[PDB]
């Protein structure tokens, strides 16, 4: 690829992007699909974040961690 200080081409100079032809119906239906979908996936992601919260805290300050600590200290003494 090119660099920040690499000058743009002479042919690409007078050109800017040309947007596609919009089919209004399908486009609208689509926008709805994406909003719904992204909403769903967002809920799922938050579900998973909660999961990670749980697993982390339980593997840290949870029951058998404390059991391990106490038991090991005990055996030690």
């Amino acid at each position: 690829r090119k660099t920040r200080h690499d000058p743009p081409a002479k042919s690409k100079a007078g050109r800017v992007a040309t947007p596609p032809a919009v089919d209004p119906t399908e486009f609208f239906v689509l926008t709805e699909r994406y909003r719904q979908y992204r909403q769903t996936v967002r809920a799922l992601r938050l579900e998973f974040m909660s999961e990670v919260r749980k697993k982390l805290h339980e593997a840290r300050a949870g029951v058998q961690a404390e059991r391990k600590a106490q038991e090991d200290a005990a055996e030690h003494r």
Partner: protein
């Protein structure tokens, strides 16, 4: 190596041989090369149908959702694949392209019956 910025991303690394592609589903930094270094390999995707007419996808779901649970972004074909599995909702573009395909089939059907005449 140290970068400026960029994100954790689950994508397709292209392993493979000329005309015979294969994909390692991968938990990677965004700014490192495609086939290059990765945080963890998640699964694998074989694009070519085998002896039984099957494209094999293996997904480590526990780690997948661990990483999405850590805020990892999915690539569009990763999305398409997870949705095809039913782990995710069908991506809107799957459905849209399905429709476009149906309309192409319809107009080719009509064009066939018009040319036959």
């Amino acid at each position: 190596r140290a970068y400026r910025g960029g994100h954790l991303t689950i994508r397709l690394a292209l392993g493979g041989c000329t005309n015979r592609p294969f994909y390692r589903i991968v938990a990677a930094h965004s700014k490192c090369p495609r086939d290059g270094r990765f945080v963890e390999q998640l699964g694998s995707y074989d694009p070519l149908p085998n002896s039984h007419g099957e494209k094999l996808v293996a997904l480590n779901f526990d780690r997948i959702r661990h990483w999405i649970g850590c805020g990892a972004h999915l690539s569009k074909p990763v999305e398409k694949l997870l949705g095809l599995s039913g782990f995710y909702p069908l991506h809107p573009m799957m459905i849209t392209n399905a429709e476009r395909l149906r309309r192409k089939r319809a107009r080719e059907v009509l064009l066939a019956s018009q040319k036959t005449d």
